């Protein structure tokens, strides 16, 4: 596992900054998407 | 060959004397 | 491309064509034959 659940604060600024930030790796049935899925932003 | 729950966990299970 | 349906005398007929086509089938029989009288096909298919 990466040492920290959430990515380093300086690694980058997220695409969408608040309550849409992808820095933290939230496992489970989260609203993220992967390579397979199309139709996303 | 035959997909399903029996294919999900590999080497992480213990205590299964499943035949063959 | 098209040779524009030349008549036997050499004049160019333009517009709609009843001439031979490679994509078209069914009307191929007797395409190459030179049929006398009034011209209804070009001088390419017949060779007139």
């Amino acid at each position: 596992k990466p040492e920290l659940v959430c990515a380093p604060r300086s690694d980058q600024m997220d695409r969408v900054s608040g309550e849409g930030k992808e820095r933290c790796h939230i496992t489970g049935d989260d609203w993220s998407v992967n390579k397979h899925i199309t139709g996303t932003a | 060959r035959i997909t399903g729950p029996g294919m999900l966990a590999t080497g992480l299970i213990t205590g299964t004397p499943e035949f063959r | 491309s098209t040779e524009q349906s030349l008549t036997c005398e050499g004049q160019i007929i333009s517009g709609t064509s009843v001439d031979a086509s490679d994509l078209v089938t069914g009307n191929e029989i007797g395409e190459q034959q030179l049929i006398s009288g009034d011209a209804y096909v070009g001088a390419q298919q017949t060779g007139c």
């Binding site: - | - | 009843v18 007797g30 034959q33 049929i35 006398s36 009034d38 096909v41």
Partner: protein
């Protein structure tokens, strides 16, 4: 239709073959079979100008290698009124 398609053959066997292909291959109406003499047989078929062209091409290829073969294949898009007197009109 008033266009005329004619096929002349050396013998009767090619003439029948030509008439068969001509009538089956378009709307053309077979009008006559005239023994010109000396072996020439003419099969005359009347129809529209587009239909006659399809028939005569089919007939000419049909009888090209049957017997002595095709002497002449001719199309008249519009026959003059006078020529219809010397043309076969009856079914036979």
């Amino acid at each position: 239709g008033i266009a005329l398609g004619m096929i002349e053959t050396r013998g009767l066997v090619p003439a029948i073959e030509a008439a068969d292909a001509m009538t089956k291959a378009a709307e053309v109406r077979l009008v006559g079979r005239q023994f010109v003499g000396g072996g020439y047989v003419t099969v005359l078929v009347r129809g529209e100008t587009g239909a006659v062209n399809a028939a005569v091409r089919a007939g000419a290829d049909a009888c090209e290698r049957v017997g002595d073969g095709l002497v002449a294949a001719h199309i008249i898009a519009r026959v003059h009124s006078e020529v219809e007197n010397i043309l076969p009109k009856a079914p036979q």
